[PDB]
Amino acid sequence: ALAAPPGELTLALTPDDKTLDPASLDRALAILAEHGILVLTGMLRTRLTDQLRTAMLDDLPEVLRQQDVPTNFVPGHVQQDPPVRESLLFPDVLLNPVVYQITHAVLGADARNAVYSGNMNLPGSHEQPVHLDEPHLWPGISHPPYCLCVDVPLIDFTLENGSTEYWPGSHVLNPDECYDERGCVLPAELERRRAVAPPVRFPIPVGSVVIRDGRLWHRGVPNLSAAPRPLLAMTHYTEWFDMPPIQLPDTVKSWVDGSDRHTHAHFVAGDVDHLTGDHPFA
Numbered sequence: 001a002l003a004a005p006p007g008e009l010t011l012a013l014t015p016d017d018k019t020l021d022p023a024s025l026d027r028a029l030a031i032l033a034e035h036g037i038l039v040l041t042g043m044l045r046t047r048l049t050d051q052l053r054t055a056m057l058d059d060l061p062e063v064l065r066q067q068d069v070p071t072n073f074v075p076g077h078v079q080q081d082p083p084v085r086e087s088l089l090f091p092d093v094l095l096n097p098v099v100y101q102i103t104h105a106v107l108g109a110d111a112r113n114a115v116y117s118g119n120m121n122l123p124g125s126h127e128q129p130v131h132l133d134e135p136h137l138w139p140g141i142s143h144p145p146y147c148l149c150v151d152v153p154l155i156d157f158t159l160e161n162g163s164t165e166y167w168p169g170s171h172v173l174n175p176d177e178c179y180d181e182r183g184c185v186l187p188a189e190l191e192r193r194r195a196v197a198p199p200v201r202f203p204i205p206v207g208s209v210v211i212r213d214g215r216l217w218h219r220g221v222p223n224l225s226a227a228p229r230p231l232l233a234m235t236h237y238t239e240w241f242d243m244p245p246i247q248l249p250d251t252v253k254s255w256v257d258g259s260d261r262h263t264h265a266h267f268v269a270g271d272v273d274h275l276t277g278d279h280p281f282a
């Protein structure tokens with residue numbers, strides 16, 4: 001049982017750090033290339049994580065009221081987008097200078113965030129199948145990354161409350177007949193991999209940011225605590241990967257648009273309904 005993020009995957013920062021020195025950036029990139037997952041501790045202030053946690057636990061009842069509750073693979077892994085009210089859209093979350101320094105270095109200067117989503121892992125949730133969030137672009141081909149997932153826990157993640165299982169080094173594996181249509185890893189390839197590089201699961205304190213290859217094998221696991229475990233998710237993509245834009249209110253256009261940290265965004269004159277997208281001119 002691991003008690004903290006492993007040294008091999010971890011870089012420790014303060015919220016005041018606005019760029020990595022060249023040696024830290026080199027280490028960040030070497031970790032993403034070799035392991036496909038990088039844990040950055042001490043990035044986000046309590047003031048932001050408190051407001052986002054509160055907003056998502058306040059919204060959970062509206063999500064559970066829906067006729068079909070949207071879930072990822074298995075019961076208890078609920079799909080919940082964080083709010084896109086002006087008051088809960090934070091430059092240090094959407095446009096984090098350290099996150100974009102890393103994604104610029106891996107994906108290029110034209111890399112863009114195209115995801116503002118979340119994962120609410122409920123008490124008593126089931127085991128997800130091992131999967132990738134974004135696939136390899138062709139079967140049986142080694143190619144570099146085209147996307148980096150940026151995962152922001154909104155409480156302390158523990159072994160008990162459903163810290164995500166990650167498969168280090170799995171992001172480069174793409175043999176023939178390795179994935180099904182849903183992005184789940186075939187059992188034969190899981191067992192081959194398990195024997196060479198088994199998965200890891202570790203606590204991640206709130207304030208941390210996880211950056212990983214969008215193709216990294218991982219799974220949500222049971223939340224065996226008394227409280228829902230909220231996770232905020234973003235994903236940076238190369239410029240040339242087709243994605244629907246994030247719906248944002250035009251109140252944040254001034255600072256989101258024309259930043260050197262790109263967002264694939266559509267700016268809406270009214271209020272955006274993050275929970276159902278049933279707002280006018282959706």
Ligand SMILES: NC[C@H]1O[C@H](O[C@H]2[C@H](O[C@@H]3O[C@H](CO)[C@@H](O)[C@H]3O)[C@@H](O)[C@H](N)C[C@@H]2N)[C@H](N)[C@@H](O)[C@@H]1O
Nearest residue numbers: 072079115117118119131132133134149182183233
């Ligand atoms: N890491 C961020 C998010 O990843 C997944 O969602 C992505 C989605 O992935 C689907 O969901 C499965 C993994 O749960 C994949 O196999 C695809 O079918 C992808 O197809 C979309 N183009 C973009 C979505 N952001 C998750 N579903 C979502 O809950 C999570 O917040």
Ligand SMILES: O=C(O)CCC(=O)C(=O)O
Nearest residue numbers: 072119164219220221231
């Ligand atoms: O929230 C988690 O730990 C896992 C969620 C997930 O990977 C997913 O839904 O794709």
Ligand code: NI
Nearest residue numbers: 131132133218
């Ligand atoms: Ni996933």
